[PDB]
């Protein structure tokens, strides 16, 4: 099923000459599976996306698809030097189904139909090791001190853990396990969305200074900032 149209082939074989390149962006999900969802496949007779120009780019935009891991793994094995991966209108995403290359900071998205998470809610409960109802009942302060009420986000419950119950170890460790999903990305920016499966878990350092933000929270509430 690996097949392409001739104009795109002509584009890719001519793609190398830029040396001023940014922001590669694709729309066709079929074509997406062929050209940057690397899928392990380091070889095709034509259709070679030219490691030099793999290296050159800065950011990637993916407009409108159904699932980025229609396969088992939406990889970015190559594309070393990205910074800003942006998702416009794919339907379902697993956050976990992505390989997330070396060092990029922004990952924004919008208009999606389904969001999994990196299922960090489970991974928290290995460490403090309590019940989910205790975690939702004993372990929620729902802080709105003064800076939380800068924005509204009034569709959403803006939660925070308790500073009393946790002895500041299994808190920093808890927070680092939150970080270990992220591989030091910072900007997240949730626009118009639909159907988060899990809760919303955000590290404190990244929600303070508002590097993550939410614009159109509609199908979604219950954000905890830890």
């Amino acid at each position: 099923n690996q097949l392409t149209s001739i104009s795109v082939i002509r584009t890719i074989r001519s793609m190398e000459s830029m040396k001023s390149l940014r922001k590669i962006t694709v729309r066709g999900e079929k074509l997406y599976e062929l050209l940057i969802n690397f899928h392990g496949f380091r070889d095709n007779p034509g259709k070679t996306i030219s490691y030099i120009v793999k290296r050159r780019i800065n950011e990637i935009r993916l407009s409108r698809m159904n699932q980025i891991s229609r396969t088992g793994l939406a990889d970015f094995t190559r594309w070393d030097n990205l910074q800003k991966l942006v998702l416009s209108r794919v339907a379902y995403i697993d956050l976990n189904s992505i390989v997330f290359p070396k060092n990029f900071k922004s990952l924004t998205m919008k208009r999606v139909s389904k969001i999994k998470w990196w299922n960090i809610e489970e991974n928290i409960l290995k460490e403090l090791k309590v019940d989910k109802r205790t975690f939702k009942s004993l372990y929620i302060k729902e802080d709105d001190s003064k800076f939380t009420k800068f924005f509204n986000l009034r569709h959403t419950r803006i939660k925070e853990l308790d500073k009393s119950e946790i002895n500041q170890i299994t808190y920093l460790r808890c927070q680092a396990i939150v970080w270990l999903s992220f591989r030091t990305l910072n900007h997240i920016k949730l626009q118009n969305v639909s159907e988060v499966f899990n809760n919303i878990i955000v590290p404190r350092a990244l929600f303070d200074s508002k590097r993550v933000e939410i614009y159109r929270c509609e199908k979604i509430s219950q954000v905890l900032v830890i």
Partner: protein, 573 residues
């Protein structure tokens, strides 16, 4: 699945197909070969797969064992180390009393006639320093010392420190007397000058002139006198006397040098000749400084400077497609290009290695094109050191040849240049060549050579390599006592390696098929591990924070025995 595989596997090399990169694969999900998928990454071993792996172990070994905890590490304790109200000025006033004027002059004219390339790399006109020797004894009577005069004081006493480090025991005995010192020192009068007393008095003269610099308030008033004094003192084993202090003063030197913010040193057409000579002077100061930056490179050296000088290969490959002052930097910068692989397990490929070799013959002929005067020990000093460095780089290069790809007869090359280096030491046992056995370039080069020849002869017992082992075993005792305990620990190391030579042959290499279980290997693991553990400063940080108290089979038992006998941490003080 999740957290998948990385690259084509043993089943993929079995079948030479596409690698769907799953667990076990999509390759291995087809035909049920998970045992073939996982038995790629217990009994006795029966192969020679230990040797390439152990040569790659030798790299990370040599980045630590030959390098850091043996040499570039001083263990200290804030409680154990005293303060300095006493011997603050006092030992310095002793050694400023004990030195005399003719006692200065004979040392000066020793170093003038015998050590020309040093102050060529430092000052040039050593008779302008004779003027400062003259102004010193006037200024010895003075009180209200200016900052400039104290800088000259620091400079001359650093040179006086340098003079002790290369004078033979006989002339120094003709100038001085063991007994007024060893009455003040209270130590044994029975020992010579050579047996550490040259060394101890040298370290004293170092400490005094640094205390002269502490009287200078050089951290309030930086000037290039500091860098010149440091480049003088770096010719000794002062980096092995106080490595942490040497890194501190190196940091101050790079701070002082870059405080003037000068990139190129060859001037325009229209400068002051004083300015032009000044910039060219900073030229040679710069290359001697970056040489020390390379030689003091370690994890207790967090600030680098020879990264800023570009590689010699990226310039020389174009045109191939004084002179010895820059040539010293050519050889050392070529070593800089060589040995980023010390901690990098990636292989140097077989072109830039060959580029270094095929330039290195031209560097060899440049050493050949140099002269040595049998009258001028400045000139034999000038030629012999370059003649040492060229074969030093040549040995390290061919060692890379045999390790990374098994280049044919690179072992024979190692043996050949080892013969050359041994005969270079042999030539040093003559008149006007004795102090050539004192400069620490041999103390590193010979250590690496004897360690690798030990490493080869523990496992591949070649009788030529074993003969070279015997020659270096003799050459161990053929060394001056100016090196001190770093000598002796090498004696320990030449012990302990050879003692490892006991344990490897007597016990069969066990494995699980590829995980080659041998207690020798685990000993060599923990060698690196304990050294790197004491190289961490985090424990000292937790100590510095105060109330945060610092907290804490046969394959097992033979390790337990040999390490409880042979502590790897026997190499500190």
């Amino acid at each position: 699945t999740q957290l998948k595989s990385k690259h084509p596997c043993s089943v993929c090399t079995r079948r030479k197909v596409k690698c769907d990169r799953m667990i076990p694969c999509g390759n291995c999900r087809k035909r049920g070969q998970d045992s073939e998928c996982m038995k790629s990454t217990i009994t006795a071993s029966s192969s020679k797969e230990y040797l390439p792996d152990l040569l790659l172990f030798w790299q990370n070994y040599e980045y630590w064992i030959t390098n850091i905890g043996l040499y570039k590490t001083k263990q200290r304790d804030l409680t154990r180390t005293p303060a300095n109200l006493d011997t603050d000025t006092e030992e310095c006033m002793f050694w400023m009393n004990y030195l005399q004027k003719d006692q200065s002059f004979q040392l000066m004219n020793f170093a003038m006639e015998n050590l020309g390339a040093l102050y060529f790399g430092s000052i040039g006109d050593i008779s302008e320093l004779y003027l400062r020797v003259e102004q010193y004894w006037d200024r010895r009577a003075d009180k209200n010392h200016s900052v400039d005069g104290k800088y000259w004081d620091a400079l001359i006493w650093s040179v006086f420190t340098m003079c002790i480090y290369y004078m033979p025991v006989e002339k120094l005995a003709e100038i001085f007397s063991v007994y007024p010192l060893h009455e003040y020192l209270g130590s044994n009068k029975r020992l010579n000058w050579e047996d550490g007393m040259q060394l101890v008095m040298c370290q004293n003269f170092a400490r005094c002139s640094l205390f002269q610099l502490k009287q200078c308030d050089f951290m309030a008033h930086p000037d290039i006198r500091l860098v010149q004094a440091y480049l003088i003192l770096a010719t000794t084993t002062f980096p092995y006397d106080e490595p942490l202090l040497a890194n501190s003063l190196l940091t101050q030197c790079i701070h002082t040098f870059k405080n003037f913010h000068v990139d190129d040193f060859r001037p325009l057409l229209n400068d002051d000749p004083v300015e032009s000579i000044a910039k060219v002077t900073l030229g040679r100061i710069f290359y001697r400084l970056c040489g020390c930056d390379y030689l003091q490179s370690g994890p207790r050296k967090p600030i680098a400077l020879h990264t800023e000088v570009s590689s010699l290969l990226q310039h020389a490959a174009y045109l191939q497609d004084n002179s010895t002052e820059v040539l010293y930097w050519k050889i050392i910068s070529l070593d800089r290009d060589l040995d980023q692989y010390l901690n990098k397990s990636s292989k140097p490929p077989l072109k830039t290695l060959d580029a270094i070799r095929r330039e290195l013959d031209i560097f060899q002929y440049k050493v050949d094109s140099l002269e040595e005067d049998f009258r001028s020990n400045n000139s034999r000093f000038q030629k012999f050191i370059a003649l040492f460095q060229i074969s030093t780089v040549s040995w390290k290069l061919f060692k890379m040849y045999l390790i990374y790809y098994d280049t044919a007869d690179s072992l024979l090359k190692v043996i050949h240049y080892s013969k050359v280096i041994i005969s270079l030491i042999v030539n040093n046992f003559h008149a006007k060549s004795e102090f050539f056995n004192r400069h620490p370039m041999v103390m590193q080069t010979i250590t690496r050579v004897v360690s690798f020849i030990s490493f080869y002869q523990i496992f591949v017992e070649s009788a030529a390599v074993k003969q070279l082992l015997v020659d270096l075993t003799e050459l161990t005792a053929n060394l001056p006592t100016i090196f001190g305990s770093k000598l002796d620990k090498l004696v320990y190391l030449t012990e302990r390696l050879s003692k490892l030579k006991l344990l490897w042959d007597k016990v069969q290499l066990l494995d699980s098929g590829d995980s080659f279980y041998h207690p020798v290997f685990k000993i060599l693991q923990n060698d690196i591990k304990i050294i790197e553990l004491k190289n961490d400063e985090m424990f000292s940080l937790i100590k510095g924070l105060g109330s945060l108290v610092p907290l804490n089979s046969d394959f097992r038992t033979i390790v337990e025995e040999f390490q409880s006998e042979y502590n790897i941490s026997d190499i500190l003080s």
